Design a protein around this ligand. Structure first.
Ligand SMILES: Nc1ncnc2c1ncn2[C@@H]1O[C@H](CSCC[C@H](N)C(=O)O)[C@@H](O)[C@H]1O
Ligand SMILES: Nc1ncnc2c1ncn2[C@@H]1O[C@H](CSCC[C@H](N)C(=O)O)[C@@H](O)[C@H]1O
Ligand SMILES: COc1cc(/C=C/CO)ccc1O
Lengths: 353, 347
């Protein structure tokens, strides 16, 4: 019965995708939001009460919903309680687990739900069918699937460009709120460039905290076209590999992990050129731990490394030494790990140390 | 703290689909088999040494494979050591993902589970909840079995997947369950390419078996001494025998459809015959045990694929037996999370 446990595990592995796809459906139905707003003083609500708030009105909706919520409950995505009905049978009622705090809109209208919709999108699951091909043939699984780099594909496909940019905006909003409570390194700058800033969430947050700072959000044209106006942020489109806007500091969050070491050095030399004599690059990334331990924090970084292998041209997760090596090879003389929040480190690459 | 943990958990949820796709790639590359046959007594081998057995001259193949194995190692799918370069070995689950003594593993089953065709329905779950219908049918414009009868590739993947999983479960069941003793003719209804029938005949050479499924399945069934492969539709009726065996058939169908099948079974059997049902049995709550998760995962899969298919409790199975004319019911045996029930014609 080491056998029994191993056979079970193999089954669990085989079906693991069903959990995020069940969660995706629950998000796309607005179930977790319906729960947050309807739950009584107990904490729990029935699938029938949930389903009366959905636009259906499929008589099989309440049972289908219960079956989905039961899977989420088994993994503690939602909580549950049992209630015995006269009509003997016991039903499940569902409540919010702590993770739902990040899967439903906070006080400012933000959650990780759009990030989950990106992670579970048909476009991001397709490259995984070409992992074996890329290993044997060379190249990038995404490019085998779509015939071009991820960014170029986003420039062709308006729906996924929007899902991607919204997903990064949401995740970054949540993490940068915490980084900004811990990290002081934006204090005193007069101008900050967010290179690869997406739709400008991070730039906007920096301006909100430091009203005197002028921020530049720089990304590809096809991203910058959808960036909402925010007073104190200028959205500039271009290509970071040709050059970046000038500023007192440059912020790059989740950019280096997208790119090979050679591409990173190219970018970082462009950042060095764009900065004044004593300026800096602020790098926000995961940092690879020494081993594939089974901690969730490590598992999450290793999962990202594998995503970078599926998606990106040479992208990968890096150790602190590897980052320090990049800084050095692009001309910076100092390196600091400055801060950490929600598993994301903030590094500074200083032109003078 | 609690926020840090909850943030982490949302991220772990978001990327959980890729774990099985990484494993799929490893199985398609034959990595687990190469490891099994190539590890030295230490039990560990480098990604470069594995990649040297792959049909490639991509110089990046080693590092790519390293990255994939690192993910599998983080989930305890493979083991690892440091020499800093990582070497990797097989964890206990790999015994079920690499051929055993009999040439069988669950690797074809994982390849089924991760096939592009079966992941597509999950994009239409929300549509089925809101509009009705079946996520599979929304994706492909026909029901699952009909799709298989149009697509040779996926037919083969599905039948090999079921065959591999059934051979592993059924071997354990047959050490445990004696209810096939004394029959002359067993009919395996929805028995796929016939693995289970062939195992029954091999343990009881005195039994003769009918392996009955759809024609597009029976077309691919290999021959086995004392099994006859018969194409048809179980909803039109089923072949006669002393007993009928149905494994992972009930869960494919709504209660109304199960009743139709079960009445057919009743009619093909003599006054003293029984239906032998092998299924999961739903436990009384969404507890976190892996055994319960597995049954709940399957319940959710039936939601994606099938018309009213679902996992059931013992009480529900007994109600199906009663409503289709069977007067006796018992839970006979269990192995590898699969119960064997008998639906007996008499009290
Ligand atoms: N050559 C190029 N120049 C500028 N931006 C680019 C680029 N190639 C990719 N990008 C941008 O790099 C970003 C990586 S995703 C990270 C977005 C953002 N920093 C955040 O953390 O939320 C995308 O917005 C993408 O469009
Ligand atoms: N109407 C029908 N009549 C006969 N077989 C059918 C059917 N509809 C579905 N099936 C068969 O039901 C099987 C369901 S999967 C289970 C297969 C096998 N009993 C095992 O456990 O390995 C498939 O082989 C499918 O082809
Ligand atoms: C390709 O770039 C990124 C992708 C993801 C994952 C998106 C999932 O569909 C997360 C961070 C990135 O910089």
């Amino acid at each position: 019965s080491s056998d029994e446990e191993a056979n079970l595990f193999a089954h669990q592995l085989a079906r693991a995708a069903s959990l995020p796809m069940a969660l995706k459906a629950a998000i796309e139905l607005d179930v977790l939001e319906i729960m947050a707003k309807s739950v009584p003083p107990s904490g729990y609500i029935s699938p029938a009460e949930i389903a009366a708030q959905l636009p259906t009105t499929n008589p099989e909706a309440p049972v289908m919903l219960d079956r989905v919520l039961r899977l989420l409950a088994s993994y503690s995505v939602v909580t549950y309680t049992l209630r015995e009905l006269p009509s003997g049978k016991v039903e499940r009622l569902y409540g919010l687990a702590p993770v739902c705090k990040f899967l439903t809109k906070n006080e400012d209208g933000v959650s990780l739900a759009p990030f989950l919709l990106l992670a579970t999108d048909k476009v991001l699951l397709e490259p995984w069918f070409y992992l074996k091909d890329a290993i044997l043939e060379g190249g990038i699984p995404f490019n085998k699937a779509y015939g071009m780099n991820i960014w170029d594909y986003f420039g062709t496909d308006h729906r996924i460009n929007k899902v991607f940019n919204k997903g990064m905006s949401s995740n970054s909003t949540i993490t940068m709120k915490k980084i900004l409570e811990m990290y002081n390194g934006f204090e005193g700058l007069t101008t900050i460039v967010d290179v690869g800033g997406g739709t400008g969430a991070v730039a906007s947050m920096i301006v909100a905290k430091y009203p005197s700072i002028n921020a530049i959000n720089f990304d590809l044209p096809h991203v910058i076209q959808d960036a909402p106006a925010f007073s104190g942020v200028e959205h500039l489109g271009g290509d970071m590999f040709d050059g970046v806007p000038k500023g007192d500091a440059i912020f790059i969050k989740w950019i280096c992990h997208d790119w090979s070491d050679e591409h990173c050095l190219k970018l970082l030399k462009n950042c060095y050129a764009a900065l004044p004599d004593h300026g800096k690059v602020i790098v926000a990334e995961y940092i690879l731990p020494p081993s594939p331990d089974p901690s969730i924090a490590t598992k999450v970084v290793i999962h990202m490394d594998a995503l970078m292998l599926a998606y990106n041209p040479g992208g990968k997760e890096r150790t602190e030494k590897e980052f320090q090596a990049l800084a050095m090879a692009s001309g910076f003389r100092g390196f600091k790990v400055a801060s950490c929040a929600f598993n994301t480190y903030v590094m500074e690459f200083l032109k003078t140390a």
